[PDB]
Structure formats: structure tokens, C-alpha cells
Amino acid sequence: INFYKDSYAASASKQDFSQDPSKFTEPVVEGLKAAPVL
Amino acid sequence: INFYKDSYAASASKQDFSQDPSKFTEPVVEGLKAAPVL
Amino acid sequence: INFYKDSYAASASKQDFSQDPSKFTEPVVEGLKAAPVL
Amino acid sequence: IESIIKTATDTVKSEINAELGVVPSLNAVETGATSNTEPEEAIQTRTVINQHGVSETLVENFLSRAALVSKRSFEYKDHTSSTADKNFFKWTINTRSFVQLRRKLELFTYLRFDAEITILTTVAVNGYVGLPDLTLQAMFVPTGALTPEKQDSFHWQSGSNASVFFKISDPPARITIPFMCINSAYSVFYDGFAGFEKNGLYGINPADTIGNLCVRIVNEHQPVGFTVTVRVYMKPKHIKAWAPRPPRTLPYMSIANANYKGKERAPNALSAIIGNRDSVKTMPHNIVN
Amino acid sequence: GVPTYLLPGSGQFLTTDDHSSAPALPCFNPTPEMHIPGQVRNMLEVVQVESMMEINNTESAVGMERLKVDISALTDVDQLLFNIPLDIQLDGPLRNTLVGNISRYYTHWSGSLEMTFMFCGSFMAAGKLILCYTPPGGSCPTTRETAMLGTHIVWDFGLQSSVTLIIPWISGSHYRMFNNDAKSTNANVGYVTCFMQTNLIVPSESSDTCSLIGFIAAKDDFSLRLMRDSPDIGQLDHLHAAEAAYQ
Amino acid sequence: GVPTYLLPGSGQFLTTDDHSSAPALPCFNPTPEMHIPGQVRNMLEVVQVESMMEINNTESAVGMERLKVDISALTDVDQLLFNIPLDIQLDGPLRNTLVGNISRYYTHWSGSLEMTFMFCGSFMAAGKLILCYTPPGGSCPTTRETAMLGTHIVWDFGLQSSVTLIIPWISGSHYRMFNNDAKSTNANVGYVTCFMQTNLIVPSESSDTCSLIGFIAAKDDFSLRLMRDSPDIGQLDHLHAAEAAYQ
Amino acid sequence: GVPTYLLPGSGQFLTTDDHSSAPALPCFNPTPEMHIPGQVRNMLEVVQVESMMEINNTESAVGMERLKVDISALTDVDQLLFNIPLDIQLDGPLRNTLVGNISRYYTHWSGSLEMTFMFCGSFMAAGKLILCYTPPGGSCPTTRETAMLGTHIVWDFGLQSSVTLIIPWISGSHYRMFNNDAKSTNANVGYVTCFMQTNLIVPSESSDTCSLIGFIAAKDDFSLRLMRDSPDIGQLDHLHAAEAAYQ
Amino acid sequence: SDRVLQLKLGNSAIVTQEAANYCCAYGEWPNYLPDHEAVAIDKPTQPETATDRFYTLKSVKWETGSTGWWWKLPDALNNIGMFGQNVQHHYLYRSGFLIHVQCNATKFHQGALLVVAIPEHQRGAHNTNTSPGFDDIMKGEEGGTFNHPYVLDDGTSLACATIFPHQWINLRTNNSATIVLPWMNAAPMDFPLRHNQWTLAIIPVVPLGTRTTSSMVPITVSIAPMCCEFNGLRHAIT
């Protein structure tokens, strides 16, 4: 329920389930293998 | 009427008319007869 | 407007225009005539 | 076999029997089955079309009504000289303190439900000035979170705890707590010990720990004292129930255990649950004309 | 904005109300459901399970002794053995039973009852009993040829240990009330009586005295109505350690 | 949330309001309906049933004696026998009647009335009466040749015991009022008068005096409007044992 | 107007409520979005990043020295080197870690942990270690042939510097609690222990003492539940210059 | 049909010639934990016939003054055979149980035993505020005796105990009772040393009596664990 004219007035947006944890866990230019890493 | 985002917020669910009283009244492996039971 | 789950909660039912006054005015087994009644 | 039951069963008319080898009134209790003798087999019956509903004995309807779970009175005053609930209290949440709800819940072994919580506040002047329209803060403190030490401690800033702020002039404050057990159901009874050492509590499943309810008056104290009483009501909803139990007969002794003593004499004595009659041939309320 | 007006009952707290309410823990995921044996969905499933009647509710019957009735060989024909008060509201052999305890959370009831009796004498013991239900209106019958005029079963002891007496729903009204006035026409069910049809006959090496266990349950034509606080439990004080929850 | 504002009349308790309200006993199943003789659905069905007029509302008429009018043989022609006041609001022969009592719960009325008279003399008694309705405007007529100018029926006693005088709805307005000012032009109905058309003639072995019972009902063109507290009942104190309900 | 009534909880301020509210600055246009590196959308992405354990939380270990464990050549076989307390709720080597700090905003947890150890001796240093996880129930093992019965990895130092021990989610319940009663059956995880599998062997020109750095992270089967105020931060006073914001 | 029974599990078998059918608790049968209910991710050991076999406990004497007897599961079996060894070496356990209770007497004896399996039989103490201690509850293989069987030692009711899975041994009718118990817990597995899912209670509601020459009338309990699984291998607590 949102009758205000400005969209920032709306309630919270709890639906964004996209993740990409590899940008913090795997920032290596050549991807790891499942295999000696070095 | 339920405008909350969490489904547990809803009102009570009074519509479940399924019964199986035999799980308490007749837990015998061989069912009774309508006939000497033993 | 009735959002309650029990139907007895509803507002009054003022729509029943059926009458049969003859059950109080004419309970004679043989109906009157419009003609000597006896 | 599982079936949808909305009304009590019909009765069919029955005739005279006299059949050899057929004895529907004989049973064998030793099997552990309940008697399957039907009325049509015991007597001659008429046909009855039965319209009586069974909805009021649904487990949802039996349990989902709001019952008192907590009641605390405290002084709202300048507390500098007090030794006491100094404008706030902490309650360790439980269902065992008020016996009417306790006995109903203890009809079952396992329960899964969400809790509708209603908070009712009332105030009286200490021994008249009128009644102040105070603001209260209730804060839920889960396991391992820090409880407030003072009315004005920074724990009340509630960065991640859920708090509700409510006025005395408001309708009762209301929130729902989800089913929050670490198991699929609460253990209404627990034949076990809470810790890996031998000294842990008997009879409480650690899995069912809710936490603490902390309630303060948010207003600074007035020049005169008041007594504030907070009542907490819980209504189970969205209920599943497993393994029905024999009801409690003897008075409850403790919230911590099932310990029992009984009343001094029947009814509900340890030696005699039902009150006595003079003999097994005595009819106590016999009609006489 | 929408023009509105408040009705009577605005702001009330009714303990049986049924509304949604604000979720205190947003996005909380409850533990997955798991299959557990023995789910109950209607309390009428419990009252259909037979449970022992406290028929021997007499002084000098202590504890377990109250759950059995002892029968002996008699030397007079057709003697009365025991009667069962049928009041579920007033204290009596039916109160502390599964049907009894659950029903006392309700005010109105309808439908048939079954009483089952298990004979627990020795194999060599023999006998016949007559179990009678008398519909209400007069006094409880004290002689067999009076009780025999009501609904009854003649029970011969044998390989099958147990007999059922059905108490059929015989009532002017759709429901009876759990009324403290037991003599009210809206409440009184009548009487169950047991007489010797023949005699208990045992050889010298069997015990001369034998026991019955009586059980009661509801049938599936049974219905309960108008929920109330059960008078079976109460407290005058706080329980032990209930205060310590605030400390 | 929805923007809203409260109107005048928010929070009022109007005793004739018509809203749904919170069910105190959820999932309660009412007793099945059963056919009962004599269902009433409109109160106009009751006012169509004829009921006795208290025409002999005089001192020295006690109890049942007030419900009959005694007629005797006269020796003067065309004499007046009785008149009936037609005020339903003011106390008079019509008040304690089914049409009267129900109508006094209302303020406005319209439609025709029937008066029926049953002659209860012996079989050998003979006579003719004239029953006249006079529309309002002047005094009640005291002579037959004045009353004869209004609406009337000439009744001959015979095998059929009873005659009807219709009082037709003759009014300037759609409705009249049950007004305590009986002389108001919005209220006054006029008069009913009974005269001898011939004479009551009886043989020596019949009783010389005979009775009429008068009845009134509404016709089905009758309508009632604007409900009010009836002035027929009141209390100055609590009733006996009304206090004991709090004890 | 629309007839309405207020429910319980009308007018409350719940800090976790979720409604629209009135825009104070109408027609305001926020600054266009710009791509920024490193967007986080779920906090579980952070707890999957490994971070150093404070295993050497001993007096006389100061600052950085607490983040490493020093290993020396021994002259007895199969000696214990260190153990790691697995309590995230009670203070211990796991608390000040990314998985630790984020998890302490929650009450319930589930899923596997990984511990990774990096050997930081010289290239000429050699050795084998055994790292054991013991599921809960008894005391922490003090001998290698006791610890060897649990879940373990035997680590040979080599060109690959680092080994992982998985702590698999082995629990009766779906979740554990961050409970201050560490011995609770709903909370205790068990133990990690490190023993010599062989020995640390170094030549004369290498340093005789070598260090391990231990890291912990969650796996992606990990879940957190029931948000709470973290006990890691607090204030007893206003901060410096917090008052000056009112001046 | 209903009177004779053979039970065979592993290297063990029992025959009875006077059964009274048998009870499957709540109509369930024991099963292994399916993947869609599992929590612990390590591969379980399932010893089968090494654990899933009848173990016989010490017999108890039925006497005129007996109040009845109880045993807690798994506690009574936690030190017996390969079931006990797997219990001691593993953090987590799950199983059903097959319970068979044995008591015979002559055709001149009378007596009735209620044989009832109670889930989560949390005991009370009599006439104290102090909760039962560890040694009041954890009786092991020997089991315990009822203090007040009339209230089931928990402020409740023997009379209503028929709501639980049960049979009777009525000496006139039958000489054995059999109850099959599924796994009965709020969690899919448990630590076997701190929680008991089931209590077997045997209560003499009708006392033993005869006028023949007296003999010792023992009651014997044989229990087979069923579908045993163990998770979280470590050293033995033992």
C-alpha cells in the first residue's frame, strides 16, 4: 500500500536475492580449480 | 485481510478438517473386524 | 461489509418479505368463500 | 484411514440379529485397540441424519485463544533510594507460570505454532492526581544478547533488537513472533538434560529457548510515584500438535518441573483423584420422587 | 483521504479475535517441517480413545485400587454388584477420563458413549453379568428385574475378555449441558448398573475374588460445543520459581 | 498506509445501527433448524387477527363482563344502543386489542379496519341492528336518522351469527398519527354507533337480555410506521429477584 | 464514510515495521546511480571470506603476535601443538573474525566451517601435522591416537603452503544457538586439535621456529537466523563532540 | 491368526503362542532418515544386524506389592552389545524400537499388566520443589520403579495413559505384549546420552493372585533397536 506520489516513500525492498561472493572470495585473474593451485 | 510481507503474520487457519483417529484407537497391525477379535 | 469468519457475526437480515397470515386468520380445514360460511 | 470430517456421523436403522459366530459386543482390550462396537450392533436404532458440526474441537480452535503468560507490577518513581524493578523489568519468557494455559499445552507432546503477543498496561497512583499517559518500550532480547541494566542504559537504543513503543492510552500493543524453535516442533515435555555435563537442567529442551522480554517506562520519573502493571497475553496460531497426553491431575508446584504433591484430600489428592462416594452401590445424585 | 468512522468495539481486546498482526522478526525462516508420528487435528480423536473409569472411588480404595472393581461368588441370586454415576460435570467415576477431561473444556455435548469392561480373573473363573443403562426420569434401579427393562447387554466370560455396553444418545434436545445441577432435565443422563446374571464360579486353586476394569470412550457421533475454562485446574499463588524468571 | 479522516458520528452508539460485529465464540455451530408451527415474519399478520373490543369499559363492569354488551327489548323505536370511541392512542375499547397493542409500538398508521359483532342470544331471539361509521368533522350522532347518513350495515340476526362493519380508510393524508390530542385533524377517525333497526324480540322461555361480542382487526391494506416505545408498559423499580441475579 | 474499528497494536512504534511513509521533500530527484565496485547484497557473502583466527590469545602475546602460532622441533613423538575453542558466542579465537563478527548479530546458525592453515617457515623447513575436529560429547582429546578417531586431515608441508580442515555441520538440530552456556547441547560444537604427525625438521641455517596462520570462513551451506544486538560494542557515555552537535 | 507370533531380527528370534495382536505406535513403522529430512552431512554408519536385534534385559519379579517398572530408551541399551559401542563412539543416534514383554503363569493365576510406551516421559519428584536429578532419571539397563504409578510419577493419570501406545498382559488371555516404536523426536537425530525418546512402563493395574502353590512370576523385557544410524564418529565416551 503506497498512495504517495514519490517512489522513495515506499516500504523496504527485501526481494534482491542476487549474490556474487566470488568478487570477495576469488578475485584471482585465473580461476581456481578443483588440482594444485600454484 | 493481510498486508504484511511475512506469511506467519496471518490470522489463524481454522479449515483443516482431516482426521485419522485410528492412529490412536486402532494401532493394531491387523485391523479389527465387525467377529471374534482373538 | 463483513470480514469476520463466522456468518453469525454479520449485520441484520431485513429482506424476508414472505407472509402467510392465513395460518392465524384462516386455520379452518375448509377454506372460507366470498357465500354463507355455515 | 485419514478422512475429512465436518459433522458427527449419521446413525442407520438396524434390525434384529441372532447370527451364529458374530459377536460385535465382545472385544479384546489386551490388543490395545479401543472397542469397535457400533450402536447399530448393540441395539435396534432408527435412521438419524446428523448435522452437528465438529469445528469447535479443531486443535486450532482449542488452542488459539489469548491467555495470560506474564504479569509484572513495578514502581514508576524516582528510584535513587530503592534497594527492586527501577522503572523497568526483565522477564525470562516461559509458558509454565499460569496453569490454565499450561494444562492445555501439556495435553500434547509436540507443538509448532506462531505466537500472537498482546501487551496490556494499567497504572495506579501510589497512596489522587490523575493517571499519566506514559510511553512504554518493550524490547525482545534473544539468547546471548545483553539485557539492559538500567532504565536509561544504551541497550535500549535497540540497533538490532526488535522493540515496540506503545502508549497507555493506545489499544494494547500487538506483535506476532514466528515459530522459532531450532527443531521442527517445540518439546512440551523433555525427558532429558540440557547440557553435556551431568549438572544441566532436567526437563527443559535447550532448543525451545525464546529469550528475554525487557520492558521500561520511557518517561523520566514524575515527582510522585505510580504503580504500573504489565500483562502479556499469548495466542498460539498456525498450530500443529503431536502425541496427545493424559491431562495434569495434581496441582502444579513449580514452573521448573512436573513435581507433584496433590491436594490434602480428594478431589485431586495423590491417593484419590475422584472424590469418594459411600460405596460402589451408592448413587450420589439419585432422583427420588 | 478516505472518510471513515469508528464503530462500537473499536480498540477492544477480545481474547478470541482473529486478525493478522505485525511480524516482529521480518524475513525470519522457520525450521523446515519434519514428519512426526501422532499428529492430532481434532480433539474428538482423543475422546474416542477408551480410558479407565474410577468406579471404586471409595474411602479405603487408595491409588491404583480405585481403578478396579472386585467381584466375589455370591449365595443369593441376581444381586447388584455396582452402579456408575453418569455425571461428567459433577465429580464421579467418569471425570478423570480422556473423554471426561476434554469434555470439561466445553459446555454442551451430544452423542453416544461406550463402556467396555475387561474381566481379569483367572482362566478357570466363569460367570455371566448383566450391564444395564437406564434412561433418566426415576431413581437408579436396585433390582435386576427393574434394571433389565432398560438397555442392557448380558456378558458371558470367555476367550474374548471384554464386553461393550453402548450408551446410546437418547435425549429430547440436540445437546446436554455440563451443568452443576445434576438433576436438571437438560443434564441428567441416567444410570449404569451391573448385576449378576448367574454367578462368579471358580475352582479352589483360583483366587476367590476377581476384578473388572471399566473403560469409557465417546463414539464418532459425539460432538462438543461452547469452550470454557475447565474447573480441573487452578492456582491460588505463584508457582515456585515463577518469580525467579524476573530475576 | 491509507490516508483517512474521521467523520461526525465517529464513535457513537446508535441503538438502531446495523453493522457486523466480532464473534465472541469462534467456530461455534448453532443447533440445526427445526420446523416449528406458526412462524411470524411481519407484525401485520398479527393485527389482521380479530380480537375482542372492551366496549363495556364502565364502572360496575368487572373483568370478563367488560368484553360484552347486553341488549334488551325496548318499547321506543330506533333507540341508540352503544357507541365505540375510535381512538387507539387514547384509552378506549380499541387499545387492548391485537391491532391496538401492536399499533401502539408505532406512530403512523393507514388503512381499513373491520369490526365484527357476534350475537350470542338464544336461537329463538330475533332482531335487526344498524351499525354506523361516521367520518370525522362533527359530534357523534345520537339519533338513527343522523347516523344512517354515514357508512353503515343493517344486520339481521340469523343462522350466520356475525356481521362485519368495514371502517374504510377515509383520510385526507396518507397516514394518521397516534396523537394524544384526539381532536387533531391528523388523528381523529370519527365514530361507530349502534342503533336498533327493529327490536330484540324473544319468547318467554328465552332470556330477556342478550349479548354482543365486538371484535376488531386490520385489513391487509393496513400499514404502520415510525417505531416508538409503547406506553402500555413501564417500571418504577427493579423487579423482584432482579437484584438476586447479581448475587 | 467507511465503517472501521481499530485493532490491538494501533498506534504502536515497532522498530522492525515495514510501511510506506510521507515524503518530506516532494519531487526531489536523487543523484543518478553509478557503478561502484564491490556491491554486497547478502551478509553471507562476507562470512565466506576467510579471516585470521586469534589462536595465540595468551598473556605475553601482544598485538600481531596473537595472530600466529609458533612451532618448534620436538624430541618426543606425536605431541599436541595447540587446540582451538570452537565457541563463537563465548570469547575465543573465532570471535574477531568476519564469520564471527557477522554471526554475533544473529542468534541461530547452521552449516559447515573451513579452517585453513598457512605454513610460514622457510623453504628448507619440512613437516607433517594432523588437524582433528572432534564432534561434541566428551572432553577435548589430549593424545594423538584419541584425536585421530575424529574427523581429520594429515598435512604435509610442501609447495602448496596451506591446508583446509572442513568442520562439517554435524548436529542433531537444524540450528545451533550462540548461547552463553557453552556446555548446552544446543550450542557446543566440539574441538579442533593439532598434533605432530611427524616433526618439524629444519637445517641449521633456517630459523629453528616456524609459524602457522590459521584462518576460518563459512561455507556456502551456512545460514544465520534471528537478528539481535551484537555484544561486541557498547557505550556508557556520550561520545566526544556528540554534545557539540546541539551547539 | 492373532494368537501366535514370530519375530526375527538379525541372529535373534522370538516366538509366542499367546500374543494379543501387536501395536504399531501411531500406525508408523521404523525407517531410516531420508535425504529431505537429514541435517548432519557426514555419511552415517548403518550397522544393520549388529545393532538391529533383540537384547534381553534382567527380569523383574512380579510381587503382590509391586508398583510397576520402567526403562528409558536408549539409556537402557547404551551399554549393551554393538548398539552400546556405536552409541559410545558417535555423537548422534537415531532408531526405532521393537519391544516385547514376556510374562506367563498358570490358568489359576490372575493379574493384569498395562504395558505402555510413553514418549518424552519427563518425570516429577513427589513433595518437593527440587527437580529430579541425573541419578533419579538415568537408571540404565536396570531401569526404575514407579513411586506413584496412579499419577505416572508426573502429576498426571494412569487411567488416561491408554492415550499412549500400549497393550495389556491379562494372564487369563495372553502372556506377551509387542509394541513397535518409530523414531519419535523433534529433531531428526539426537545425542543418545542426554535425552530419552521413549519410556517403557509396565504397571500391574490388577495385582498377581492365585490359590495354587506360589512360584516366582518374572516379567522379562526384550528390545530390538530398528534402523539404527549413527553420525559424528569420534573417540568413545564409554
Ligand SMILES: CC(C)Oc1ccc(C(=O)Nc2cccc3c(-c4ccc(CN)s4)ccnc23)cc1
Ligand atoms: C518486544 C517485542 C517487539 O517483541 C516481543 C517478543 C516476545 C514477546 C513475548 O513475551 N513472547 C512469548 C511469551 C510466551 C511464550 C512465547 C513463546 C513460546 C512458544 C513455546 C514455548 C515453550 N517454551 S514459549 C514463543 C515466543 N514468544 C513467547 C513479547 C514481545
